[PDB]
């Protein structure tokens, strides 16, 4: 009964802000590595960011200074705040547990949510 | 005002008392120093910045001021230490047909730094398309004339 | 700082055949640091193999992984129509790195 | 042995210096010059200058 | 193809806040004088505020301390944040390029947006 | 700090006639600082004249502006039904100042 339900996608104007939410069931967000990975329309998978169980956060160079990962233990929900969104940020974002490293692989995956950056 | 003149004064005795009682000044405001104490003070150098503006723009010549003259023609620092004197020059800078010799900067991408002089006459690009030195739509001459009468 | 390249770009094999996908590394990468993920159309990626040889829970036995160093192989024996998907190889040196993907078409 | 330098083992030693409000017990190599005799020199013996 | 499309009008309770947006096409918001002018129902035109290309802002005495003009260069959009709105603030607001001074006249004008302050 | 007053409040003239709108200033205002704007019902104001004599781009030649000092005049020759609108005179001394407007009715 482990699920990751994503929300917060949709249309955002260039230069605007948005927040993607990822409610988790069957696992503790605050006690697991939680990663955001984005896939552009028709392109491959790109890891966006990760938050450790201890609170440390890391971001890909393509999103450093614009994205911020966070969590809410009470709601057991992962959050990704995106700012100064551009055309290249239009993509489907997935939240996953793990960091793709030995014993910490991306499992499970949410259904994803589409974000479109256009005027 | 956009080409405000500056004179550097050094190695001389500055007689402020006679200076301030010579003509009738419609505006005389000092900041960081009193007019009567200057006779007791020594300085490395003095700068006399002279120009002509509108009467309603005289208020823009002071610390912490903003506006077309303050932002694009002549800017003073917030901690300015010195005096500003202004007097009407209608009998001198006005013509029957209009005195258009005096100009001021109207368009500029960014505000001037204190004591910065900008004499550029480049066509101002108000739109996405480049102007290439041709004034037209979204391409304006940066200076405007007063035409004093 | 190790770049992974997947091959071939697209693969067309009839059902029941043996499908081979290659993931080459410019530098020798430990086997334990490589994984294979599957992504069917309109679905999120699913973990197929981890450690370059260990089959993920709930994955059919026909999917296998092998290789080491600068060459890793994902093998799909007895290919089925439902196997139509994109397969990615992923690893970690200083941050997660995903491959370019491999399309597996069925004739 | 055939892994990349990023995955190869590295031995790390960290030297930390605990300086408390107590008499010190560890000092670096004391720089001692050759002894000179029968000539006015600026001598220093164990901090006595 | 120069246009100024306004949005953000509607109903706001007394004492509430609102933000009017003005998307510009054919001109650069950050490089032009951008003014907000309001017209009460059945009354004349009243200049509300202006922002210079250099960033300096000015406001009419009727709105000083309650209105704030701003811009977003990436979106090329002008913004007017109105706070502590009262009955007299009910009006149609237009965004225009220029300040109504020689060589800087209000041109062009947006279609305007109506703001109604009522309970 | 110069107040502009427009006259008359309303004007009723048959098509083809000459319409005169006056804008008086308590103080002598330079001609270059005055402009005339037109606003038809349910539409945003449109710049008609700037500099008190210069016709804005795309404006019919029948609209003209003149005057100086404390009196400015907007003239609409060969008045047409489509000219039904409100005409405002605007200037700048320390901030934009708009006139009270003038309604132009057509008999």
Author numbering:
A (entry chain E), E (entry chain H): 1 to 119
B (entry chain A): 347 to 495
C (entry chain F), F (entry chain L): 1 to 107
D (entry chain B): 496 to 544
Quote the authors verbatim.
Alpha-B.1.1.7, Beta-B.1.351, Gamma-P.1, and Delta-B.1.617.2 variants of SARS-CoV-2 express multiple mutations in the spike protein (S). To understand this, we generated 674 mAbs from Beta-infected individuals and performed a detailed structure-function analysis of the 27 most potent mAbs: one binding the spike N-terminal domain (NTD), the rest the receptor-binding domain (RBD). A detailed structure-function analysis comprising 22 X-ray and cryo-EM structures is presented for 16 Fabs most in complexes with RBD or S, which allows an understanding of the changes in antigenicity of the Beta S protein.
This is explained by our previous observation that these mAbs are for the most part sensitive to mutation to Tyr at residue 501 of the RBD, while rare changes in the LC CDR1 can confer resilience. For example, in mAb-222 isolated from individuals infected with early pandemic strains, a proline is inserted at residue 30, which can pack against the Tyr-501 without the clashes engendered by most L1 sequences (Dejnirattisai et al., 2021b) allowing it to effectively neutralize all variants. The cryo-EM structure of Fab-222/Beta S shows that the majority of trimeric S particles were in the “2 RBD-up” configuration, with both upward RBDs engaging with 222-Fab in the mode expected from the earlier RBD/Fab complex structure (Dejnirattisai et al., 2021b). This is in-line with the RBD “up” engagement pattern seen for other IgVH3-53/S complexes (Barnes et al., 2020; Dejnirattisai et al., 2021a).
